[PDB]
Design an enzyme around this catalytic site. Structure first.
Site, mmCIF file in Angstrom:
data_model
loop_
_atom_site.group_PDB
_atom_site.id
_atom_site.type_symbol
_atom_site.label_atom_id
_atom_site.label_comp_id
_atom_site.label_asym_id
_atom_site.label_seq_id
_atom_site.Cartn_x
_atom_site.Cartn_y
_atom_site.Cartn_z
ATOM 1 N N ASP A 78 -6.342 3.341 -1.469
ATOM 2 C CA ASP A 78 -5.388 2.382 -0.958
ATOM 3 C C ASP A 78 -4.030 2.460 -1.673
ATOM 4 O OD1 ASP A 78 -4.641 0.445 0.857
ATOM 5 O OD2 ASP A 78 -5.535 -1.248 -0.275
ATOM 6 N N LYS A 91 -0.304 2.491 -1.955
ATOM 7 C CA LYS A 91 0.801 1.960 -1.155
ATOM 8 C C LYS A 91 1.671 1.155 -2.106
ATOM 9 C CE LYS A 91 -1.990 -2.007 0.447
ATOM 10 N NZ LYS A 91 -2.198 -2.868 1.652
ATOM 11 N N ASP A 142 -5.109 -2.927 -7.692
ATOM 12 C CA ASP A 142 -5.879 -3.208 -6.455
ATOM 13 C C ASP A 142 -6.936 -2.131 -6.184
ATOM 14 O OD1 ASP A 142 -5.014 -5.780 -4.749
ATOM 15 O OD2 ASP A 142 -3.135 -4.993 -5.542
ATOM 16 N N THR A 181 -5.093 1.335 4.272
ATOM 17 C CA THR A 181 -4.052 0.554 4.955
ATOM 18 C C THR A 181 -3.449 1.429 6.049
ATOM 19 O OG1 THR A 181 -3.616 -0.711 2.911
ATOM 20 C CG2 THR A 181 -1.899 -0.787 4.649
ATOM 21 N N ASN A 209 0.500 -2.032 -3.821
ATOM 22 C CA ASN A 209 -0.531 -1.916 -4.838
ATOM 23 C C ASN A 209 -0.039 -1.252 -6.099
ATOM 24 O OD1 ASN A 209 -2.338 -3.085 -3.209
ATOM 25 N ND2 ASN A 209 -3.436 -1.229 -2.584
HETATM 26 C C1 LIG Z 1 -3.276 -6.789 -8.166
HETATM 27 N N1 LIG Z 1 -3.675 -8.105 -7.653
HETATM 28 C C2 LIG Z 1 -2.474 -8.824 -7.166
HETATM 29 S S1 LIG Z 1 -4.494 -9.031 -8.843
HETATM 30 O O1 LIG Z 1 -4.625 -10.425 -8.357
HETATM 31 O O2 LIG Z 1 -5.787 -8.421 -9.238
HETATM 32 C C3 LIG Z 1 -3.509 -8.980 -10.353
HETATM 33 C C4 LIG Z 1 -3.871 -8.126 -11.405
HETATM 34 C C5 LIG Z 1 -3.100 -8.056 -12.574
HETATM 35 C C6 LIG Z 1 -1.970 -8.854 -12.684
HETATM 36 C C7 LIG Z 1 -1.613 -9.711 -11.619
HETATM 37 C C8 LIG Z 1 -2.377 -9.776 -10.458
HETATM 38 C C9 LIG Z 1 -0.472 -10.389 -12.010
HETATM 39 C C10 LIG Z 1 0.165 -11.315 -11.186
HETATM 40 C C11 LIG Z 1 1.429 -11.858 -11.430
HETATM 41 C C12 LIG Z 1 2.073 -12.581 -10.480
HETATM 42 C C13 LIG Z 1 3.252 -12.991 -11.010
HETATM 43 C C14 LIG Z 1 3.307 -12.518 -12.314
HETATM 44 N N2 LIG Z 1 2.186 -11.816 -12.542
HETATM 45 C C15 LIG Z 1 4.460 -12.759 -13.292
HETATM 46 C C16 LIG Z 1 5.228 -14.034 -12.874
HETATM 47 C C17 LIG Z 1 5.487 -14.202 -11.357
HETATM 48 C C18 LIG Z 1 4.349 -13.853 -10.366
HETATM 49 C C19 LIG Z 1 -0.179 -9.930 -13.311
HETATM 50 O O3 LIG Z 1 0.767 -10.263 -14.019
HETATM 51 N N3 LIG Z 1 -1.085 -9.008 -13.678
#
Ligand SMILES: CN(C)S(=O)(=O)c1ccc2c(c1)/C(=C/c1cc3c([nH]1)CCCC3)C(=O)N2
Ligand SMILES: [Ca+2]
Ligand SMILES: [Ca+2]
Ligand SMILES: [Ca+2]
Ligand SMILES: [Ca+2]
Lengths: 304, 145
Positions: free
Chosen positions: A128, A130, A149, A169, A133
């Site tokens: 996946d 893209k 992801d 995707t 991700n």
């Molecule tokens: C890859 N997927 C979105 S997840 O839910 O498994 C995941 C995996 C590792 C991650 C985050 C999200 C993740 C999300 C995230 C969202 C936001 C931030 N980190 C920093 C502040 C604004 C919004 C992060 O920092 N590390």
């Protein structure tokens, strides 16, 4: 337990049966992203997928892969502690910028290819790839791109291939998956080609609102490099894209080979000098006569 | 054209002393800078008239062909004598009848030239026939004739 080891703070995002919260390792003060999965809501099948995903993420340690630091199972909740990233998705950075320069695109795809090559070396096919991700580690202009992801990732044995299922995707799907043929590591290299194309001009090589037509175009390899936007893009960039977007997966460039392509790794004159026998003689007499003549001319107004 | 190559070179040298910015033309301001640097005090109207008298094509500045043709003027022999004598007096700042190396150096500095003391001595020796270290009136005349 989790709350003895980690302090949780605000919600950063949501997922299927899950929330991501900023967290901090209690004794050290280092911050992470905790993915909190409500396992009371997961079927056995979905928990089995979580098991595979966590196993695969644990295996992968690389600067261009989002790192899983901890997996903690509690009653009704499973916690996965990942790198915190603040740069958002590569997808959104592309939208914000429209497209990348060749310098910046090459640098970006180079890191993506390193992440894919690491997966492949470890018997993992992501399936996946893209821009959605791929995460930017921070807001730095120099931030690392990190593959995330791994929910569709699979474990393969060497170069053995099989029908691993229709998964991925739509715009990024390889012809071999669309034909329902056995497949393997090369599907990630096809997806890499779609991403490189998007990096360079800001739109995908295959797109149609009718998905059947989309799939037909992909299977046909019906893409081109139209004018005027592609006119100033170097042929070396187009050549690498060509080698990734090759329909026959045995002939498609691998991640390791792509990392040696000149557009990626060769981005960064002597003439004879004649002997000087001497310097040119100062012409004292011409210097003096020029000065005297100048003065003669200068004195005419005073005389006349 | 009826001048020798060395005569042309000498006038190109003179031209370069007027053309301070090296753009191949002499402006009124450039002319005035040279004149005043040589102790001459023309009015601004006089400077512009000098430019106008020599500026054939009427573009407001003097190029090398215009500059040449001017001193391709075979003027009176009495006028050339006068020019040479008044010029001598410009170099001979203390009026003792001899141009010393120091006096020549001062003229070249005033003109904006940056010569070494050895180059100035070499220049004195080109004119200093009797070898006393200075250029007298007779030697100065001999040089320019
Ligand atoms: C890859 N997927 C979105 S997840 O839910 O498994 C995941 C995996 C590792 C991650 C985050 C999200 C993740 C999300 C995230 C969202 C936001 C931030 N980190 C920093 C502040 C604004 C919004 C992060 O920092 N590390
Ligand atoms: Ca000039
Ligand atoms: Ca003119
Ligand atoms: Ca004197
Ligand atoms: Ca003498």
């Amino acid at each position: 337990s989790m709350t003895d080891e980690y302090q949780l703070f605000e919600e950063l995002g949501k997922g299927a049966f899950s929330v991501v919260r900023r967290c901090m390792k209690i004794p050290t003060g280092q911050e992470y992203a905790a993915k909190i999965i409500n396992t009371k809501k997961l079927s056995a099948r979905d928990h089995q997928k979580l098991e595979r995903e966590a196993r695969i993420c644990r295996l992968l340690k690389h600067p261009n892969i989002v790192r899983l630091h901890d997996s903690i199972s509690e009653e009704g909740f499973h916690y996965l502690v990942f790198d915190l990233v603040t740069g958002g998705e590569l997808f959104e950075d592309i939208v914000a910028r429209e497209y990348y320069s060749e310098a910046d695109a090459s640098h970006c795809i180079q890191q993506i290819l390193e992440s894919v090559n690491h997966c492949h070396l470890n018997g993992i096919v992501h399936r996946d790839l893209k821009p959605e991700n791929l995460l930017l580690a921070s807001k730095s202009k120099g931030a690392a791109v990190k593959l995330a992801d791994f929910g569709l990732a699979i474990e393969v044995q060497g170069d053995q291939q099989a029908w691993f299922g229709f998964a991925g995707t739509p715009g990024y799907l390889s012809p071999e998956v669309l034909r329902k043929d056995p497949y393997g590591k090369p599907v990630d290299m096809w997806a890499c080609g779609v991403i490189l194309y998007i990096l360079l001009v800001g739109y995908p090589p295959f797109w149609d609102e009718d998905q059947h037509r989309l799939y037909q175009q992909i299977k046909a390899g019906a893409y081109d490099f139209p004018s005027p936007e592609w006119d100033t893009v170097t042929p070396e960039a187009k050549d690498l894209i060509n080698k990734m977007l090759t329909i026959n997966p045995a002939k498609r460039i691998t991640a390791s080979e792509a990392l040696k392509h000149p557009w990626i790794c060769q981005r960064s004159m002597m003439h004879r000098q004649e002997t000087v026998d001497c310097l040119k003689k100062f012409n004292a007499r011409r210097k003096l006569k020029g000065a005297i003549l100048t003065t003669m001319l200068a004195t005419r107004n005073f005389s006349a | 054209d009826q001048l020798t190559e060395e005569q042309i070179a000498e006038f190109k040298e003179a031209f370069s002393l007027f053309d301070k910015d090296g753009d191949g033309t002499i402006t009124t301001k450039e002319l005035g800078t040279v004149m005043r640097s040589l102790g001459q005090n023309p009015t601004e109207a006089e400077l512009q008239d000098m430019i106008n008298e020599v500026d054939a094509d009427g573009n407001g500045t003097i190029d090398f062909p215009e500059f040449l043709t001017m001193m391709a003027r075979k003027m009176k022999d009495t006028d050339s004598e006068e020019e040479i004598r008044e010029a001598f007096r410009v170099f001979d700042k203390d009026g003792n009848g001899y141009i010393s190396a120091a006096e020549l150096r001062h003229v070249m500095t005033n003109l904006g030239e940056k010569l070494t003391d050895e180059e100035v001595d070499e220049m004195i020796r080109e004119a200093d026939i009797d070898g006393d270290g200075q250029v007298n009136y007779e030697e100065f005349v001999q040089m320019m004739t």
